[PDB]
Structure formats: structure tokens, C-alpha cells
Write a protein that binds this ligand. Structure first.
Ligand SMILES: Nc1nc2c(ncn2[C@@H]2O[C@H](COP(=O)(O)OP(=O)(O)O)[C@@H](O)[C@H]2O)c(=O)[nH]1
Ligand SMILES: [Mn+2]
Ligand SMILES: [Mn+2]
Ligand code: NA
Length: 610
């Protein structure tokens, strides 16, 4: 007849231009999802501007008239976040995806059988793009033609995803030319609202919360996401690819894909080093990644604020790239005070989601610390006039900026270097109101892997385990991931970074933070820097090395309560090790490596002799 040829529906580009396997992915899914048109994205400025104005004319976004090319999306309140409960990974065997927990409920991932997924898929995708354009987004995670970069193709029915993916990845025609006949991750996305609409459209924001499902199929190199337009559910390069699929790839291939910022720190003498840090969301990665140091002569430069791909090179340096092309940061809390470098970044060419709008076309959120002129009013993220009298924030707590990384005033000159940046330190941390000192240093690589494994952080009151800040993101069995980290010591050449753990959030008996934080965290970074150099600035404790007395620069800082801030209590740490023991036994068990169990035994013994 005319085959399975969708050429007649192509409104930009050509199916004949596509590499063979890309064409097959596009056409097969056009046959399944029945889009009205196919738009192959070129990544051009013209494409982007027109798509924005189109969304503008449909009421999907508003233009923010105060700024150079900035935009505002307000969502359906049912679709406001990446949703872990609807997030699953498919493998033949459950144990390959998560360890089998002794308690029967795993905190370390959600598995679904191939059978169950096929039924779920068939219930969702057939005809799901009826009446819509299927956009084909060819994208690079990493600098174009970096040896560490990986290519994806995302099919989506959301122009919001297209625009946001232009920022957060490298996308367009240059990627298709770079890809050629190579392998790529297949990323399928639908908002799940075929036309004609069966359910009312809320806030011009297409979604299907009842059928929302974010699936990963590592053995097929597929990510298939249905029903949410938001964040990590729809922007498939970010979590789905650059952590969940990429952690699996990394394990197979001998590298690491982690939930880590990469920042550069320069002393007053001009001396430079790169550091990576894994904190859970809402524990300050973006802030640290673009920190404005208070300590004079110190400089911080940003490589990435969220994801790090790391591979030992043939010299044994741990090379890291940021696979992202932008920051997708939580907007609330961002002020000139807390994060001035973010604020300079987001003044132009930025897409805001679920933040408030001022009457003069500006953006507003909790913690912005920017007084408004009398007469200037605020429209909340729910499209209502808002005042601080109300018992609701003007912006959703998970609201966002999505901004190009290149616009960061302190973007590192090597942030796109195809070889990556050499990592000399790896920092773990989160929110611990009690017990855990400002900073310590792991005693060995094995100890450091244990420190990552043991991470706990206040929920954003409950304290939960979040190993390596990867709890939401492991692409495979966490015990095996532990073994993969430990295996890095068994290769000759590898120059293993020093591992540290931090805590900004230690609080006193009256619930006041014992440490100021923010730009004062440069004093902790200072202590860390010297240690990589070999400075004799450390005191041994049961948990690791801490700063020696007077080793931290507290100058310009008045009287910080250092005794409480560095206190290490036998009673706290004996409870700590017991809790950790029971967690690893329950959640990891048969897959817990011998070396991590040994480190737990060693820590317990050192605490017992306090
Ligand atoms: N008290 C305190 N709060 C902080 C510090 N760093 C970040 N925060 C707060 O933690 C919240 C999350 O910051 P953010 O950079 O979004 O964390 P991310 O989600 O991990 O990238 C914001 O409300 C920040 O103001 C700190 O050093 N001390
Ligand atoms: Mn962030
Ligand atoms: Mn993150
Ligand atoms: Na809207």
C-alpha cells in the first residue's frame, strides 16, 4: 500500500535524513501513538522562539516581560514533581534491580516484571498522541563528541519538554550528525491526553495522573514515560537516562554515574582542584556548586549542579563531566544572599515553572529576599492574587527555574572540556540536626564507600537513609553498586580521591542552627583542600579525621560554638551504628559486600572503645 511510511506527516526535517535505527524508532512509535504530525527538532533559535510563542498563544506559558526572553509555566496541581511511586525498572530478575529486602519492602528501587510492564504499556500508549505533534528530540548528554558523552532520542507530545530539553541537554541537528549509525538511548514520552480530550484540561497543562508511569528498561536501552509533563518524569535525559540507565551502563563499562555537583575551588595563591559532592535534593548542591565564597582570595567555579559522569583515564585521574547543559533548580530559597550566582544566571533565557509573577512581569518566590515597591502585587503559582496574609506560599515548594549553564557567571572554563575535569575529592552530606560534625574525612577508600552507604538525611520530622544520595536513582541492585565502587581500588593507576562527609544542619537544644552555612561553608572547603595536599591539619576520631583545634578559619566569624559543632558523642554514635547495621541487613543483606560489613564492624569497635 504505502508501507509503514509516515513521511507524509513530517512537518520539519525528513525521515530519510535520519540514521536507520533512529527512523525505525520514530516510525514504530508513530504507528503506535498515532500523532497527527512529526517534527524533527533542529535545535535552532528560530525553532525555539516560535515554539515558545505558539505555547504563548495557546495559554500554555506566559512571557515574563521584565526579562530578556524568560517564560512562565503553571501546571495542573496534580502534576508538580518527579513521582518516585510511579517510577519503575524492568529486568528479568527482581534481584538485578534491587536487593531482596528481608522485611519485604525495599527502599532502594521499585521493580516491575516484563509481563506486567507490557500490560501497563498496552493500556496507555496505543493512540495516545492522536491530534498532537510528536517531536523528535535528538540530544547529547555531555559535551558534543566528548568520549564520555552519550546520545539519546526523545519522542514527546509536549512542546514544554522540547523547550526545556533545549536548555537542559544539547539538542538538534548537530547531534544527529554526531550520532550517525551509533547506539542511542530510546526515550518515549507522552502526556497521555489524546485528542479529543476525554477529561477536562486543567490550567492548560496536559497530564494523566491516574496512568502516570515512568519506566526504565536497561536491557533494551529504553526509557518509556507516560502521563506526567513535569521535571524528571518528562525531561528524560536528566534522571531517567543520566542516572538510572547510565548507572547501569557505568557498571557494565567500568565508570560512574552519580548524583553529584562538580565545583572548582581556587585558594588565594591561585591553586586549583575539582570536587564532586553527593547531597540529596533540598540539601544544598546547587548552592554549593555556585557558591560565592566569603573567605577572601577563595574562588568557586561551577561545572555542574546535579549529575556527574566519572571515569578513570589512562593516567589514573578520575575524570568527570557534567552530562547536563543547564540547571533545573528549585527556585524557592534562592536569594542574592543565599545564591547570587544562580540569580545572575536566571535573569535571561530562562523557563520558570510554578513560581509567582509580580505585576511588573517579574518572578517571585519564598526566600527571594527582594522587597517589592509599594503597589506591586503578586500572582501566585495557582493564578490567584496573593499576599503574605494567606496560609499558602506564592510559589509551589518544588517550583523551578530551567536555565542555560553557559549563563552562569562563574561557569568553569573546562565545564565543556571533552576529557572532563580531574576529581581530587568526593564529598557526601545531608541534613542531620544532631550528632554529626561539620566535616570529617574517611580513613580509606573502603571506609569512604561505607560513609556513602551510611548516609542519612532529614526528610523534606523523620530521618531517612539516602545512600550516596542515590536512593531514588539506582539503576540496579544497590549491593552490586557498592561492589562496583569498591572495585575502583583494585585497578592499578587509579588515583582514588579523598572522601569527606559534611553537615550544615546541626542544631542546638533550641532548634537553632549551630553553623551559619551558605558562603561560610567555604571555611569547610578550605579545611578539605589542605588535606588533599597532605597538610597535617587533622585529628583522628572514631568516625574519621576532623579538623584539629584552630585548623578551621573562623576569622570574620565571631564566636561559633565549635565544641557543640564538632562534638562526637559515644551514645549518639552507638545508636547510629546500630541503626545503620539494621538498615544494611534488612535492605541489602546477601548483596552487602564483605568490605562494607567489615567497615561497619570496625566503626562499631572504635566507638565501643570511646
Ligand atoms: N541552613 C542552611 N540551609 C541551606 C544551606 N545550603 C542550602 N540550604 C537550604 O537548603 C534548601 C535547598 O537548597 P538547594 O540548593 O535547592 O538544594 P538541592 O535541591 O540539593 O540542589 C534551600 O532552602 C537552601 O536555602 C546551608 O548551608 N545552611
Ligand atoms: Mn539543585
Ligand atoms: Mn537532583
Ligand atoms: Na498553565
Amino acid at each position: 500500500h504505502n508501507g509503514l511510511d509516515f513521511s507524509a506527516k513530517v512537518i520539519q526535517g525528513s525521515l530519510d535524513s535520519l540514521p536507520q535505527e533512529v527512523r525505525k524508532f520514530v516510525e514504530g512509535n508513530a504507528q503506535l501513538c498515532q500523532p497527527e504530525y512529526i517534527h524533527i527538532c533542529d535545535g535552532s533559535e528560530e525553532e525555539y522562539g516560535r515554539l515558545l510563542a505558539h505555547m504563548q498563544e495557546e495559554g500554555v506559558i506566559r512571557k515574563l516581560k521584565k526579562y530578556d526572553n524568560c517564560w512562565l509555566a503553571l501546571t495542573d496541581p496534580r502534576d508538580v514533581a518527579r513521582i518516585q511511586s510511579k517510577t519503575v525498572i524492568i529486568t528479568q530478575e527482581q534481584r538485578d534491580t534491587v536487593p531482596i529486602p528481608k522485611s519485604g519492602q525495599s527502599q532502594l528501587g521499585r521493580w516491575m516484571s516484563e509481563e506486567d510492564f507490557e500490560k501497563a504499556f498496552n493500556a496507555r500508549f496505543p493512540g495516545c498522541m492522536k491530534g498532537r505533534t510528536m517531536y523528535v528530540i535528538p540530544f547529547s548528554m555531555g559535551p558534543l563528541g566528548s568520549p564520555l558523552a552519550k546520545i539519546g532520542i526523545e519522542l514527546t507530545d509536549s512542546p514544554y519538554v522540547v523547550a526545556s530539553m533545549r536548555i537542559m541537554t544539547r539538542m538538534g541537528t548537530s547531534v544527529l550528525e554526531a550520532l550517525g549509525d551509533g547506539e542511542f538511548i530510546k526515550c518515549l514520552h507522552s502526556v497521555g491526553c489524546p485528542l479529543p480530550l476525554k477529561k477536562p484540561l486543567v490550567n492548560n497543562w496536559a497530564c494523566n495522573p491516574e496512568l502516570t508511569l515512568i519506566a526504565h528498561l536497561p536491557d533494551r536501552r529504553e526509557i518509556i514515560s507516560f502521563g506526567s509533563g513535569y521535571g524528571g518524569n518528562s525531561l528524560l535525559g536528566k534522571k531517567c537516562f543520566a542516572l538510572r540507565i547510565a548507572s547501569r551502563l557505568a557498571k557494565e563499562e567500568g565508570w560512574l554515574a552519580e548524583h553529584m555537583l562538580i565545583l572548582g575551588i581556587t585558594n588565594p595563591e591561585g591553586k586549583k582542584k575539582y570536587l564532586a559532592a553527593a547531597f540529596p535534593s533540598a540539601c544544598g548542591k546547587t548552592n554549593l556548586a555556585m557558591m560565592n565564597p566569603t573567605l577572601p582570595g577563595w574562588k568557586v567555579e561551577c561545572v555542574g549542579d546535579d549529575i556527574a559522569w566519572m571515569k578513570f583515564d589512562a593516567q589514573g585521574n578520575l575524570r568527570a563531566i557534567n552530562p547536563e547543559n543547564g540547571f533545573f533548580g528549585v527556585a524557592p530559597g534562592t536569594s542574592v544572599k543565599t545564591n547570587p550566582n544562580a540569580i545572575k544566571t536566571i535573569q535571561k533565557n530562562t523557563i520558570f515553572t510554578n513560581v509567582a509573577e509580580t505585576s511588573d512581569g517579574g518572578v517571585y518566590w519564598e526566600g527571594i529576599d527582594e522587597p517589592l515597591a509599594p503597589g506591586v502585587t503578586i500572582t501566585s503559582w495557582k493564578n490567584k492574587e496573593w499576599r503574605p496574609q494567606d496560609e499558602e506560599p506564592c510559589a509551589h515548594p518544588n517550583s523551578r527555574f530551567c536555565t542555560p549553564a553557559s549563563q552562569c557567571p562563574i561557569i568553569d572554563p573546562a565545564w565543556e572540556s571533552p576529557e572532563g575535569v580531574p576529581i581530587e575529592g568526593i564529598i557526601f552530606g545531608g541534613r542531620r540536626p544532631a550528632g554529626v560534625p561539620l566535616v570529617y574525612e574517611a580513613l580509606s577508600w573502603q571506609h569512604g564507600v561505607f560513609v556513602g552507604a551510611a548516609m542519612r538525611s532529614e526528610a523534606t520530622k523523620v530521618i531517612m537513609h539516602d545512600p550516596f544520595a542515590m536512593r531514588p536513582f539506582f539503576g540496579y541492585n544497590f549491593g552490586k553498586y557498592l561492589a562496583h565502587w569498591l572495585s575502583m581500588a583494585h585497578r592499578p593507576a587509579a588515583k582514588l580521591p579523598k572522601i569527606f562527609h559534611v553537615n550544615w544542619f546541626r542544631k542546638d537544644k533550641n532548634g537553632k542552627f549551630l553553623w551559619p552555612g551558605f558562603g561560610e561553608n567555604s571555611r569547610v572547603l578550605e579545611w578539605m583542600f589542605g588535606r588533599i595536599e597532605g597538610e597535617d591539619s587533622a585529628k583522628l576520631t572514631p568516625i574519621g579525621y576532623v579538623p584539629k583545634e584552630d585548623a578551621l578559619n573562623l576569622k570574620g566569624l565571631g564566636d561559633v560554638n565549635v565544641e557543640e559543632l564538632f562534638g562526637i558523642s559515644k551514645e549518639f554514635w552507638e545508636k547510629e551504628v546500630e541503626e545503620i547495621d539494621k538498615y544494611l541487613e534488612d535492605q541489602v543483606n546477601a548483596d552487602l559486600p564483605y568490605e562494607i560489613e567489615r567497615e561497619l564492624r570496625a566503626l562499631k569497635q572504635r566507638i565501643s572503645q570511646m
